[model samples]
Target: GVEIETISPGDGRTFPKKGQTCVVHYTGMLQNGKKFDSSRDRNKPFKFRIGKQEVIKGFEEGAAQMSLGQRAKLTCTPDVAYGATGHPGVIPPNATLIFDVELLNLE
Candidate 1:
């Protein structure tokens, strides 16, 4: 578990200013550590703008608080992730989501 410092803010928090995009490497999982998605293992960083609806609400919301080169892990409930609909066949209902993210840069 984390012992000190480096905690980012939460929902309704302000995101980065976005004339460009944020480049990231991310891995997502379940609370149980079951891997769901990854960008690095695919050998490429993912890039999206803040507040652009390019990612899930939970993801974009969290990414907004990040500074360049910061790494963070976020635990988000289904409503903030994919909601009760849960993407069906992709994400199950009411699942808690985990995201391991590195904020590489914002441009």
Candidate 2:
């Protein structure tokens, strides 16, 4: 199962749609609260096209529902995240992921 919640909704009504690019700052962690990745820590946000298979399904879905400047959290099961075969060296197998995502821009 996946759960999404808006922490700081954006000011505009316009949101990212399919094939659109999204710039976001995020921190990813495992269920045990071990950090896996963080765009914020790197001092740069990540940019990817929505509905283009550029990222994990859960990440794309959660960002797609957000507008520019929106901040949200996504709790994703393995199926929608890395799946049973997780990313080696980053995420363990069949791990659930939690992401604190902030939408920076849409293009």
Candidate 3:
């Protein structure tokens, strides 16, 4: 599963809804502090639909717990992230990830 550490809360009245495209800014890194991706570095937020399997499990699971503007540190174990066969070139085997994430918006 995933562990969510709330750095700052988001909108009290709204949370991401399933089937909606969620926008987020995040830095994806390994447990050893190696970064693989960052929306902030590109000056663009990443977008993906909720309840979809196409996105990484940590991104999906972490995004589910946040609301617009919510900022959190999402530490995901291998069970909720890439398994032994991690993404080629971008990640290594059995990677444990920590994503500094913020829910930017919903589309």
Candidate 4:
């Protein structure tokens, strides 16, 4: 399951639909708070289409719950994340993932 806590809910009335594209910033980490990846540090925003399988399940689910300019913390269990296999070098098996994400734009 994925747990989502809205840190800053956006004021935008338009929300992303299943097939729409969006721009976002995110920081991914383990439950121990060891950071693995962050768009902010890269000085870039990640752009992707919504509801596609291009990213991890939790990422898609978490982003879908946000409106434009919203920020949130998403806690993802293995089932809704990388699962038992996880990402080979980046994530350990059955690792729980935590992400701080901001919906920057609906493109």
Candidate 5:
């Protein structure tokens, strides 16, 4: 399971649903505090459809739980994250991942 930590609450009361599309800005990092990726670097939010397996398991789980405009921190364990073989050239093997995420839009 992914751990969800609330950083700031937003005005949205509803979360995104399956088959629904959602947009978010996030910073992905390794457990050791090294940055791996971020949508904010390019001033754009990453958009993904829920329940479509487009994103990683942990991110899908965590992002699905968030309401629009809410900012959160997701601590994704290796099993729910990039398991044994992480993203090459950035994440190492068996590493835990973290994401600072803001649920930007949902439809």
Candidate 6:
């Protein structure tokens, strides 16, 4: 799986800088590894900026550290992934998130 790929940088080391936009193929899952989202599954990728909280802190920070073609797994804590406010019933407070991210392109 992508998570086991050694090509990716860990933590905030692979993410883009502030205002930087990256195009990626990714999958989001619960702490127990239940997949919740996937760009590849939808036959496309996702694009977003760093430092603007377009995604979550963990994902944004990790994606910023990657170079083109890098792929890695990001383990996001509740605080950095989703705050205590959460996203209502969809995302529970204190839940952790795991993202397998592939940096396809950047701008």
In TM-score terms, which candidate is top? 5
TM-score of each: 0.79, 0.88, 0.88, 0.90, 0.91, 0.75
Pairwise lDDT winner, candidates 1 and 4: 4
Q: How many Å off is the CA of 64 in candidate 1?
A: 0.9
A best-first ranking of the candidates according to their lDDT comes to: 5, 4, 2, 3, 1, 6
lDDT of candidate 6? Answer: 0.68
lDDT of 6 by residue, 31-96 (tens): 865678889988767766666656766765676556767777777778775558777766777788
The local lDDT score (0 to 100) that residue 23 gets in candidate 3 is: 78
User: Tens digits of per-residue lDDT for model 5 on 1-107?
Assistant: 88888877787578788778888889987787678898999886777788867888888888877787898899888876667887887877788888889887858
Error of 2 at 84 (Å): 1.2
- Local error of candidate 1 at 6, Å? 4.2
Clashing pairs in 4: none
Mind sharing the TM-score for model 6? 0.75
Off by over 4 Å in 3: none
Which residue pairs in candidate 1 collide? none
Q: Please estimate how well model 2 matches the true structure, expressed as its whole-model Cα lDDT.
A: 0.79
- lDDT (CA) per prediction: 0.69, 0.79, 0.78, 0.81, 0.82, 0.68
Superposed on all Cα atoms, model 3 deviates from the true structure by an RMSD in Å of: 1.5
Residue 99's C-alpha lDDT in candidate 4?
86
Q: Write the per-residue lDDT of candidate 1 for residues 1-107, one digit (tens) a residue.
A: 12112345433233467676778888878776578788978977876766657687777667666676666778776777666788767688888787787776646
Candidate achieving higher TM-score, 3 or 4: 4
